[PDB]
């Protein structure tokens, strides 16, 4: 209590700083896929399989960092 309760509330807010890398990662992979698809004709599969698989690897950092912040407040 006291010092233990105040450190648990501040831990969930400071752990949310990692969302900048995971949030901008979905836009970096989408910018190269949209600009590269206009070269004819990366549509079905090819570039679609690398964009779907690449977005799941970049989103793993935001989901793993959010679990440590939610465990301290619950």
């Amino acid at each position: 209590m006291q010092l233990v309760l105040a450190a648990k509330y501040i831990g969930a807010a400071i752990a949310t700083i990692g969302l900048t890398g995971a949030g901008i990662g979905i836009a970096i992979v989408f910018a190269a896929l949209i600009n590269g698809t206009s070269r004819n004709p990366s549509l079905r599969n090819t570039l679609f399989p690398f964009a779907i698989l690449g977005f799941a690897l970049s989103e793993a950092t935001g989901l793993f960092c959010l679990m440590i912040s939610f465990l301290l407040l619950y």
Partner: peptide
């Protein structure tokens, strides 16, 4: 070890 999709992706 990187099982943050399929089942884990449904919660997000």
């Amino acid at each position: 070890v990187l099982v943050l999709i399929e089942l884990l992706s449904y919660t997000a």
